[PDB]
Amino acid sequence: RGTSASLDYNETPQTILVGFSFASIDIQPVTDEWTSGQEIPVVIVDADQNKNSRADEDLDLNNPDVTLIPAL
């Protein structure tokens, strides 16, 4: 964390900074009470799991390179 690299085209260099992101998890109940037999969303926001800006990524148990998975 905090270290960087430098890439240059057209005599204008740009830093490639390495950093971590704070995560946020929140269960979102559709109405006032969560009752039996109702699906409600669970949303996680962590930029550290977005390892590709040109692809949509899944938190698969079976992949060792997904470092964290939510659990109940």
Binding site: T3, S4, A5, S6, L7, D8, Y9, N10, E11, T15, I16, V18
Partner: protein, 73 residues
């Protein structure tokens, strides 16, 4: 090329300090489908005569702070 997909290859290591080495630019060392597509031929000393104004050169520094752990591969 106005009809094809243009491929360029760069030697970008700005800390290779070997006397013989220079940052350089090469044209069509590969295809747009990742085939050979020909040999690599120097362009570094001719870029001035081909209307290049500081815009034909790519350089990279993998470890900027020299911390011992390289950031980019």
């Amino acid at each position: 090329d106005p009809t094809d997909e243009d491929s360029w290859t760069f030697a970008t290591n700005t800390k290779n300090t070997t006397s013989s080495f220079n940052v350089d630019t090469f044209y069509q060392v590969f295809d747009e489908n990742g085939a050979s597509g020909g040999s690599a031929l120097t362009l570094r000393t001719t870029l001035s005569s081909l209307m290049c104004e500081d815009n034909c050169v790519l350089t990279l520094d993998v470890d900027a702070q020299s911390s011992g752990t390289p950031v980019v591969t």
